[model samples]
Target: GEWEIIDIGPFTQNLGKFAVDEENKIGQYGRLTFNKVIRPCMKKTIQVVAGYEYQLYVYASDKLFRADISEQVVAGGRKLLRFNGPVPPP
Candidate 1:
């Protein structure tokens, strides 16, 4: 019933290792081919009412990104939520 920001100290950081398929660009950006992570610059979590969501911000290959991840429970059972994938921030 409340939005809580959880502190999830440093772990394994993945910020930049992504392979964008420039050959097959999607609009102005390329399709995500492969994503590898290392050296996380920032990391945090959100306590969603249903479950928890991880906020990982890292820099890789001279780029910046944050992974959109969440955990959920359905019908009193463990149910993992969909991964929103890595997104670029301004």
Candidate 2:
């Protein structure tokens, strides 16, 4: 089955260095090689499935890239999701 893609308008975040700092591991979202020392300036929420998944595009320095994230609702209602990325636009 094909999932839907939702445009979330324009958005931006002040991610600081944690967005890409290798030493800054966030929950299930880890740092990518390309994002390794840079900070993400802006982002756009491209897709989402409440409590299930999320997708977004972020600007790391001068490059525009994207990530696909999905969560596993586990015990205690904890949401754990993995970050897969550098997904260049098609």
Candidate 3:
């Protein structure tokens, strides 16, 4: 399996962090997993795009939250995924 687990940016309220791989072909069909526990879940979120149709599975361990996408959709795209977190806090 050639998974990449690229890092995503930071979010606002009630939401943790995320990670996904399968670079080069941006938004291509691939697998991604979001698991982690931070300050606060702030809010709720559960929508994604870019690649083909994706399936998402979710779980939580209080200290950590996790979401996993199927390995089937791990190829096909024309660009690269981008991130938005990890900058100097204000």
Candidate 4:
């Protein structure tokens, strides 16, 4: 199956550090405050189901976060889909 790398970005948190500093009082931040570099790779796979050409988009991101496949489906067809969403901190 042919594939391609589509999107990638970084994920970071601002509030987690403040919470950890306040709670732990160790001058250290929460582990979640660390910046996570996420590379979301989207690949299109074609398969014939009931004689219809069905496309499946696969997305893989770093940090093992929850990735919804439906979001990637919008990028299908001849045009590209653009939108914005919040990326939670690592």
lDDT (Cα, tens digit) per residue for candidate 3, span 5-90: 32333542113322333331353434445554443223223334454445444555645444555534354433323544445633
Candidate 2 per-residue C-alpha lDDT over 7-53 given as tens digits, one digit per residue, 9 for 90 to 100 = 33232121323334433355344534432223233334544444667
Better of 2 and 3 by TM-score: 2
Q: Write the per-residue lDDT of candidate 1 for residues 1-90, one digit (tens) a residue.
A: 333433332322112321233223332434554444433343234443557788989788979999878886654532223235447752
> Count of backbone clashes for each model?
4, 0, 19, 0
User: What RMSD does each model have against the real structure?
Assistant: 22.1, 21.9, 19.9, 19.9
* Residue ranges of candidate 2 with Cα displaced over 4 Å: 1-50, 75-90
After superposition, the stretches of candidate 4 with alpha carbons farther than 4 Å from their true spots are 9-37, 48-90
- lDDT score for residue 37 of model 4: 34
What is the lDDT of every predicted structure here?
0.44, 0.44, 0.39, 0.40
Candidate 4, residues 3-46, lDDT tens digits: the string is: 77655542112233333335444433333333433444455665
| lDDT of residue 8 for candidate 4 | 50
lDDT minimum window of 10 residues, candidate 2: 8-17
* TM-score, per-candidate, Cα-based: 0.25, 0.25, 0.18, 0.19
- Candidate 4 residue-wise lDDT at 41: 42
For candidate 2, report its TM-score. 0.25
Candidate 1's TM-score reads 0.25
